[PDB]
Design a protein around this nucleic acid. Structure first.
Lengths: 211, 38, 175, 142, 58
RNA sequence: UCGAUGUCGGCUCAUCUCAUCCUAGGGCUGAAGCAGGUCCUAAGGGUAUGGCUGUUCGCCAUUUAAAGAGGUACGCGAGCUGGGUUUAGAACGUCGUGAGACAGUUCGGUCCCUAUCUACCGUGGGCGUUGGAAAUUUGAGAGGAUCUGCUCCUAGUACG
RNA sequence: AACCGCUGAAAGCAUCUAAGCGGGAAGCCCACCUCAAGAUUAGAUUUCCCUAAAGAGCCGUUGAAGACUACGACGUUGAU
């Protein structure tokens, strides 16, 4: 139930001997250093905290420097927690190591990332609203929202109405993705599929919850 | 069964049974005699 | 009437009452029922008389059912209860192996039923199940559960049916 | 001679512990509501909180009569179209046990700033223990 | 307000407000609810004696 | 309501009901099977594209698991359209001596408003959270999602 | 839920129900994804700091982040 944090390196293909192209995405896995083990006695729940990447010393606060020093690890670019159970808290000690060995070839994974940000978007792109007529006398409402409600009853707009607003740049999970290849010496994780986000983004790969 | 406002025993093998405050006719001879009030 | 009828205790069987929980112990085994808080239980020479705490219709209707359950427990501990299921069909068959009974009736898959703790099944032939139990309730529930995998059909009688169960028969291709 | 008010700085709130074990929900709730309001005190003034802190244990053991454990419905609207949700007394006792008695008392308290301040003195817990031995509540059979 | 204070005071030692007012009426005590609530709030012993009178009258 | 509450239809965007159209669970059957018919439960999802006509509808073609019935100012013109109805031009039939008229027809005929408050979609500032800070988090709760065809196999078996 | 029960009395029988014990729907509550402590009941844990500290911000170079913001990165001990 624990995963690892990597960086989206970009997309490519893997060819099979039958001549099928598999769309894959490449994840750089630096070492996931364990910075804290949360247990039920102290925190009320079981989790593993890891860090990965690096920061320069001038960019790490005194509080975070002490947090990393208590574990014995080097400061990473971020800190991520994975909810675990007694089975997961087996060989996981503070200052310990999590590599790409966590996953096997052919294992289904869930991958989470920040989607690409589209900024402010209209209803047509954000919610697949139909466009109104391009011609036929249509005035200046070609990509307009259309009606936003009923009449006097209810005399308001219902909450959760689909409107323009910020699109993308949100946490998104894609489930049911296959591990195409694992390599740990090079920190390589090759996964079948799309992987939300841009290249260089932080991605979290966990074992698939559908199973 | 027949769900209706008037449930009455039909043949003579029908029973009026009430369960959960509701009136049924249950017949041991004719399965289409089964009635429930409602 | 049922409430006023006393429960005659055979030589082997015995009943004890500890904190509103009657236990019947005898040669077959041990059964127990929770005594309703509107019924009192008193014992005499090899007989148990159970009577309402107050003279009321509700208390009498509860002591009737306590008497009936106690009588069933006494008989089920002195000799036990037995139920018989028949299977009718071309390839319908049953096999009892321990506490788990398998039935091949008409599905793309045999059905496997685990008997409740207290009911024992044996199949002398392949189309006949004999169930034995201490309590009539658990025996009847096991029989109903097994019979509900393929209840009898009116047009040919196929299915699992109770022995001495009247199955309605209808005629196919009528005019 | 005049009729004086209670002067909040001069008022003292006493701590009491109530066992809600097998007691009727509304019959207990009215008593608690009166104690939280301070109606049992001769300095009662409706614009001052003169109440007492009430700590209720065994909140999951409170009782209702009739068929109300399965027919008493708790509705809420979430603010979204069609967002009407319903739950049972028994399901709510299993899920959030304190909310049955909290809801009953909130219904009986006045609805305004002072009422919000008086419901804050109701400390209700499922189970036989409360974390308020420091306040030394006196056992109150009400 | 006075009636609420007197009810609190009478229930503090003994009977309810309604029975207290009946007892005062039977005892021929002409003290008004304003003074009664003042004594309930500011003189607990005097209100106790006043309640004892109404209680002895019933 | 006449010191003005814009009409039908379409478009866009919906929201609710259940007297349920499909899908789900059932009882009865003049239920052999496959298919149905009725009624009970069930509102989670889903629930065509075209030809004609301004049409709603309706008929028709071809589909679909299905092409539900409704409420919402017969939802929705300070969101769009302007084909019909319902100004002024003109003509036909008809009525009138006539000026004219016609839920008769025909051709033509300006749709304004930069959003204050409520609402809603997003996105910030402040303060608070019992000294302050950097992080990581539990989850009271809320939203989203929930559809379904066909082929093979069981098995050309059960049934006939 | 409808519906089907087991045992069972009221009501010697019968009976799914009154006591008790079962099965059972795309529906309900979880489970999946996202948000979530202004949940003013403002929760938890790990570190850091207190004669202007720990930090945060301004400013600058900026970004598959973006209306402005915010958010992410970096500012010579540096590839922003």
């Amino acid at each position: 139930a624990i995963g690892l944090v990597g960086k989206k390196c970009g997309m490519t293909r893997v060819f099979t001997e039958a001549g099928a192209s598999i769309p894959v995405t490449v994840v750089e896995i630096s070492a996931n250093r364990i910075t804290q083990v949360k247990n039920t006695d102290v925190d009320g729940y079981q989790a593993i905290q890891v860090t990965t990447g690096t920061r320069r010393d001038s960019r790490v606060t005194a509080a975070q420097k002490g947090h990393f020093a208590k574990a014995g690890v080097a400061a990473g670019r971020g800190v991520w927690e994975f909810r675990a159970n007694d089975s997961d808290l087996e060989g996981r000690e503070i200052g310990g190591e999590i590599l790409a060995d966590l996953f096997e070839q052919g294992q289904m994974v869930d991958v989470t990332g920040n989607s690409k940000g589209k900024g402010f978007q209209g209803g047509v792109k954000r919610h697949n609203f139909s466009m109104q007529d391009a011609t036929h006398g249509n005035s200046v409402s070609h990509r307009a929202i259309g009606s936003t409600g009923q009449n006097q009853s209810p005399g308001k707009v219902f909450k959760g109405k689909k409107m323009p607003g910020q699109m993308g740049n949100k946490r998104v999970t894609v489930q049911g993705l296959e591990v195409i290849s694992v390599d740990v010496e090079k920190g390589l994780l090759v996964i079948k599929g799309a992987i939300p986000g841009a290249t260089g983004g932080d991605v979290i790969v966990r074992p698939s919850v559908k199973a | 069964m027949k769900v209706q406002a008037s449930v009455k025993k039909i043949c003579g093998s029908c029973k009026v049974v009430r369960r959960k405050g509701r009136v049924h006719i249950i017949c041991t001879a004719e399965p289409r005699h089964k009635q429930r009030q409602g | 009437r049922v409430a006023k009828a006393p429960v005659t205790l055979p030589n082997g069987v015995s009943v004890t009452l500890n904190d509103r929980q009657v236990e019947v112990k005898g040669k077959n085994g041990n059964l127990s029922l929770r005594l309703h808080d509107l019924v009192e239980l008193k014992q005499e020479d090899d007989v148990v008389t159970l009577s309402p705490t107050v003279d009321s219709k509700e208390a009498m209707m509860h002591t009737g059912t306590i008497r009936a359950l106690l009588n069933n427990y006494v008989i089920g501990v002195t000799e036990g209860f037995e139920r018989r299921l028949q299977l009718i069909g071309v390839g319908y068959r049953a096999q009892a192996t321990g506490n788990k009974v398998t039935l091949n009736v008409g599905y793309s898959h045999p059905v496997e039923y685990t008997l409740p703790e207290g009911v024992s099944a044996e199949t002398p032939t392949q189309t006949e199940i004999v169930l034995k139990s201490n309590d009539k309730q658990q025996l009847g529930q096991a029989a109903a559960k097994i019979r509900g995998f393929r209840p009898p059909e009116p047009y040919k009688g196929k299915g699992i049916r109770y022995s001495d169960e009247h199955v309605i028969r209808k005629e196919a291709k009528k005019k | 001679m005049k009729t004086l008010s209670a002067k909040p700085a001069e008022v003292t709130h006493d701590w009491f512990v109530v066992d809600a074990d097998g007691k009727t929900l509304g019959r207990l709730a009215t008593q608690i509501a009166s104690r939280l309001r301070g109606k049992h005190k001769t300095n009662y003034t409706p614009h001052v909180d003169t109440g007492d802190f009430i700590v209720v244990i065994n909140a999951e053991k409170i009782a209702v009569t009739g068929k109300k454990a399965q027919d008493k419905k708790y509705y809420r609207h979430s603010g979204y179209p069609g967002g009407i949700k319903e739950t049972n007394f028994t399901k709510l006792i299993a899920h959030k046990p304190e909310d049955v008695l909290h809801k009953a008392v909130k219904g009986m308290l006045p609805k305004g700033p002072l009422g919000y301040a008086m419901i804050k003195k109701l400390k209700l817990y499922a189970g036989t223990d409360h974390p308020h031995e420091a306040q030394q509540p006196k056992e109150l059979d009400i | 307000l006075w009636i609420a204070r007197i009810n609190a005071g009478a229930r503090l030692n003994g009977l309810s407000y309604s029975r207290f007012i009946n007892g005062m009426k039977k005892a021929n005590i002409t003290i008004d609810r304003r003074v009664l609530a003042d004594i309930a709030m500011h003189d607990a012993a005097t209100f106790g004696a006043l309640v004892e009178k109404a209680k002895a009258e019933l």
